């Protein structure tokens, strides 16, 4: 649980999440998917304390899936992000807080607009064109400040992400064993098979 990136382009949101799971001096897994589908047009990536991450992600997934059945309606990305933030904002003054940081990428079918939300473990929510959690931001934010154009396409966005991943592989001390990339658009959620 180290690298989670997000880029919002013209017509979609791209989430990139590191595949390595490490405990001690051993990489236990190199194929870990640090993301849960909250609804057909809303994806959440997560990073933080072991156990807490998946437990929090699955809990949110269940609550959104419950809302979807009850109302026979897909909650907007803004609504899902506001719900998620409130759960983290409860957590921080709990007996044992969830130490989980999340990106929420969604396509709003009402506005026909892609939306990327960055929420830290305190429940600090912010809407961005692109975002990151942990030490990834220290390299990727300045890079994206340079090459990011708002009217970019999905292909341009993927090339921009490759630049981010190549920079991270060069200058980051730990080996994150590459990234799983997922695109969220009007047609739903699909995984880029080769990156």
């Amino acid at each position: 649980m180290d690298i989670i990136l997000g880029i919002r382009v013209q017509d979609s949101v791209i989430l990139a999440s590191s595949k390595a799971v490490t405990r001690g001096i051993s990489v236990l897994k190199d194929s870990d998917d640090k993301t849960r589908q909250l609804s057909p047009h809303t994806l959440m990536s997560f990073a933080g304390e072991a156990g807490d991450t998946v437990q929090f992600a699955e809990y949110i997934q269940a609550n959104i899936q419950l809302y979807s059945i009850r109302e026979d309606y897909e909650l907007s990305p803004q609504a899902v992000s506001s719900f998620v933030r409130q759960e983290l904002a409860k957590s921080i003054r709990s007996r044992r807080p969830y130490q989980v940081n999340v990106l929420i990428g969604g396509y709003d079918k009402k506005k026909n607009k892609p939306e990327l939300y960055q929420i830290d473990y305190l429940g600090t929510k912010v809407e961005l064109p692109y975002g990151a959690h942990g030490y990834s931001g220290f390299y990727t934010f300045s890079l994206l400040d340079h090459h990011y154009r708002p009217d970019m396409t999905t292909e341009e966005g993927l090339d921009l992400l490759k630049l981010c991943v190549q920079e991270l592989e060069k200058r980051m001390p730990m080996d994150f064993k590459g990234v799983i990339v997922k695109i969220v658009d009007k047609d739903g959620i699909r995984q880029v098979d080769d990156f």
């Binding site: 960055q118 912010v126 961005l128 220290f138």
Partner: peptide
């Protein structure tokens, strides 16, 4: 400005 200590995160907060 919204930051995480030294890191600037958002310029629309």
């Amino acid at each position: 400005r919204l930051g995480s200590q030294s890191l600037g995160v958002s310029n629309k907060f």
